[PDB]
Design a protein around this nucleic acid. Structure first.
Length: 48
DNA sequence: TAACCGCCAAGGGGATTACTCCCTAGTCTCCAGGCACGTGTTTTTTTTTTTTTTTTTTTTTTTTTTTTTCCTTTTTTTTTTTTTTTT
């Protein structure tokens, strides 16, 4: 994301920190567990 | 302008007297509708059982198998020990 430490880093900088340059991210780390948030369908509010 | 009065003339019908007659007053005598008493059969009221729809409750949702993850309380009041200040 923008506010994380892996923001706009190069492949060499990600590799030196033992991170995958091909990793897209998109997940939280909660207690060492990778958690992903699923988008939920809902009705369109304020619609007749 | 004809009401009213005076004068005169004419006639029409209610009052009067008598005769008649006939319809009702009165009195028996028989009998029958008018009336006093009893009651009814429809009319209203009340129960009674059902009917019919609405509402609520309750129970249900194919089976078997294999991996992770999180949690398996928590704040809030009461108690009890400790520390500091004062005479």
């Amino acid at each position: 994301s923008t506010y994380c430490l892996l923001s706009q880093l190069t492949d060499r900088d990600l590799t030196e920190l033992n991170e995958c340059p091909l990793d897209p991210g998109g997940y939280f780390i909660i207690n060492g567990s990778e958690k992903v948030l699923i988008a939920q369908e809902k009705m369109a509010t304020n619609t007749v």
